[PDB]
Amino acid sequence: MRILMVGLDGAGKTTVLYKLKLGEVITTIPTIGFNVETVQYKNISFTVWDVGGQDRIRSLWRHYYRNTEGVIFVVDSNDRSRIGEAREVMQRMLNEDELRNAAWLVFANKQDLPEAMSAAEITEKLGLHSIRNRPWFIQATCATSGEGLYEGLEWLSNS
Amino acid sequence: EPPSEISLKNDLEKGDVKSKTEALKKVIIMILNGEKLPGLLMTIIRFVLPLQDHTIKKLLLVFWEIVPKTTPDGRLLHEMILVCDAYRKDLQHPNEFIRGSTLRFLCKLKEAELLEPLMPAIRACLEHRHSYVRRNAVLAIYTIYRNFEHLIPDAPELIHDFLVNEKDASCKRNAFMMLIHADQDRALDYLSTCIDQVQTFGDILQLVIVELIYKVCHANPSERARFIRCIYNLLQSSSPAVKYEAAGTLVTLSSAPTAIKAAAQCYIDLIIKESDNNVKLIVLDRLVEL
Amino acid sequence: MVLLAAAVCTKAGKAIVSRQFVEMTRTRIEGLLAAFPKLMNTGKQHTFVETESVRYVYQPMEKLYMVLITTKNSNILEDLETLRLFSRVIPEYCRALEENEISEHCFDLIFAFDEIVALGYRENVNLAQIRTFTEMDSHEEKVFRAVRETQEREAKAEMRRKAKEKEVDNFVDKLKS
């Protein structure tokens, strides 16, 4: 499965990732590009593109326009900024059809790091409330917290 | 309607790397013509940031290098920044050979958006205790100096101080070669310093100075003594290379009857010693000039 | 640089393999060179010819020629060593001699040019050792085991988390005068 971590990565969106991968943290320059890992479960080995949603990189991902299989949205839960705007973008994913081949997870990260919204509050706000032709249970992490994640995921590959 | 591009794609799976190798060769040959039509790029793209296969990477990489890169896609295929970050890491790689090899490549490489923080990256790599790696930077830099010298601007001195830190002859030799091309002056300052020490030392680096000195006088002189002091020491002269040059430089410098004699001798003995005829002729030719 | 190309040659009017240190032009520099080489200019023997201030340096080794080219002066012996040296190296590098073997180990061979010679500089000795430098390394491994492992631990653990959750002078004076 191709699992997608998008948003601008360098924020620790990438931290979020590095924490998974080695246990470590962003010891890279804030990272625009594909970051790749394979994580093996159900031995679907999830190939993670942790990709900055920075300008080009957001702009240009067409070769990566193919067909999805897993969704992480790694979240600045202090961002409560680009999300409406995001919602406005997000529609075009919705308007993609490759994009409807994943039972997913939005991950609320960066909770400790300032705060976060109602699990619901966000849910409408990115436009998330509105799906169903993909599952849509919700899971919070932080980026110095997160557990039960895997419940979210559990259902998800086993969709 | 379908094509063998695809035929290659399955092979790659089938083997892994192995099949891919085959693919590289084919691709290569295909590439060699010019020729190709795109799409495998995607494959390449897909598997390669998440894949190893070092040799293959080396093949791949080189392929990129020889082939264009300001590809009608851009400029870049357009990912020339993203993929690099792994590579940058590799370039970062603690793994010294790996960096060095990259560097080697890198000397060949010249892709700018990628370069900029790799400028930082490289700087770190210079520190690595391996002279191979460091040396490789000397080429690389050389490559910059024409392409985007400026990219780094503080360099000529930086090098020059670096020389101070330095002591690996191999690297030194290099250091000189580039240094004079950036600026002679630094070399000269050092030259002043080195003057006595030279004799002790290995030739190759010594050679490089001989060229430099030459160009400047025809434009302007007044400089002699300091040199002379050394030069006389150089009138030991003893490697066949050294000697070969040593008389040759002399004449360049001088032609006093005494000078005429000095060089002459060197030849005559030389010849006498000499064996490769091809060589012999050559000096004549000079002589013929003379 | 002290060589813009090294091309290893076979008798065929054609040079069996080559590499272009610097690209700009097209083969016509190289292509033209190839043509001339194949032609040999009927010329009888002699392992060297320089003409028009261009060294064409070669060595017959058999039906094969190994070729280097240069235009302005050089110290010979060194050079020779190399031609010869090539003639030492190949059966190791690409396996013996017949184009094919080389055809398979092209990558190896080109790699050898670079490796051997960094821009007209005689880099080392010891072929095996030469292997050593890359695609044969050491550091990377050292790092990998420890690291990979460390991560792995984190991963393993994760699996659970996941799972559940005087002289001078003589001259000098004379001159000075």
Q: With helix as H, strand as E and coil as C, how does chain B read?
A: CCCHHHHHHHHHHHCCHHHHHHHHHHHHHHHHHCCCCCCHHHHHHHHHCCCCCHHHHHHHHHHHHHCCCCCCCCCCCCCCCCCHHHHHHHHHCCCHHHHHHHHHHHHHCCCHHHHHHHHHHHHHHHCCCCHHHHHHHHHHHHHHHHHHCCCCCCHHHHHHHHHHHCCCHHHHHHHHHHHHHHCHHHHHHHHHHHCCHHHHCCHHHHHHHHHHHHHHHHHCCCCHHHHHHHHHHHCCCCCHHHHHHHHHHHHHHCCCHHHHHHHHHHHHHHHHHCCCHHHHHHHHHHHHHC
Under 8 Å CB-to-CB from C77, ≥6 apart: which residues? Answer: B240, B241, B276
| Residue C61: CA count within 13 A, CB half-sphere | 22
Confirm or deny that A11 is annotated as ligand binding: yes
- In this structure, the dihedral spanned by the alpha carbons of residues B16, B17, B19 and B20, taken in order and rounded to 10 degrees, is 120
The Cα–Cα gap between C71 and C67 comes to: 13
Q: Do B49 and A29 touch (CB under 8 A)?
A: no
**Is A139 annotated as catalytic?**
no
Cβ–Cβ of B256/C75 closer than 8 Å? no
Rg, chain A, Cα only: 14
In whole angstroms, what is the distance from residue B66 CA to residue C110 CA? 12
Nearest to C27 by CA among C43, C45, C14, C40: C14
CA distance A38 to A40: 6
Q: How far is CA B58 from the centre of its chain?
A: 19
Q: At A147, phi and psi to the nearest 5?
A: -160, 160
Structure-token match 């391996």, residue found: B130
Three-point CA angle B189, B194, B195, nearest 5°: 105
Residue C69 CA to residue C9 CA, distance in Å, equals 12
List the Cα angle B23/B27/B29 in 5-degree steps. 120
Cα(B229)–Cα(B195) distance, rounded to whole angstroms? 8
C48-51 sheet: strands from edge to edge: C17-20, C5-10, C64-70, C54-61, C48-51
- Contacting residues for B126 by C-beta, under 8 A, at least 6 apart: B133, B134, B137, B162
- Measured CA angle at C94 (ends C90, C98), to 5 deg: 85
d(CA C174, CA C169): 8
How many other CB atoms are there within 10 angstroms of residue A128's CB atom?
A: 18
Resolution in A: 10.1
Question: C-alpha distances in angstroms, B82 versus A50, B49, B77, B113?
Answer: 11, 9, 11, 10
CA distance C82 to C69: 12
- Closest residue of chain C to B66, computed from CA coordinates: C23
Alpha helices in A70-131 (DSSP H): 83-94, 119-125
Taking contacts as CB-CB distances below 8 angstroms, the residues of chain A near C162 are 41, 150, 153
Instruction: Give the integer Cα–Cα distance in Å for B11 and B18.
Output: 9
Give me the sheet containing A139-140, strands edge to edge. A36-41, A44-50, A2-6, A70-74, A105-108, A139-140
Contact B249, B243 (CB under 8 A): no
- CA distances for B157 relative to A47, A156, B82, B160, angstroms: 46, 59, 33, 5
* Distance from C-alpha of C155 to C-alpha of C161, rounded to nearest angstrom: 9
Q: Which chains have 3 or more CB–CB distances shorter than 8 Å to chain C? A: A, B
Site of tokens 């059809």: A97
CA C104 – CA B28 distance, rounded (Å): 12
CA distance A77 to A75: 6
The answer to whether the annotation marks A9 as part of a ligand binding site is yes
CA of B142: which chain C residue's CA is closest? C1
**If you ran DSSP here, which 8-state letter would residue A11 be given?**
G
Whole-Å CA distances, C115 to B117, C30, C133: 27, 22, 9
A20 CB neighbours in chain C (<8 A) are 158
DSSP label of A136: B
- Helix orientation angle between B96-108 and B84-92, rounded to the nearest 10 degrees: 120
Sign of the C-alpha dihedral computed for residues B92, B95, B96 and B98 taken in this order:
negative
| Token duo for residue C106 | 């092209």
Query: What residues of chain C, 9 to 28, have a C-beta less than 8 Å from chain B?
Result: 23
Q: Is B126 exposed, middle or buried (CB count within 10 Å of its CB: 0-12, 13-18, 19+)?
A: middle
The total of other beta-carbon atoms located within 10 Å of residue B43's CB is 17
Residues C58 and C70 sit within 8 Å (Cβ to Cβ): no
d(CA B238, CA B207): 13
CA distances, C154 to each of A41, A47, B11, C110, C149 (Å) = 15, 18, 35, 42, 9
Question: Whose CA is closest to A33, among A15, A49, A44, A21?
Answer: A49
- Give C111's contacts (C-beta < 8 A, 6+ positions apart): B58, C134
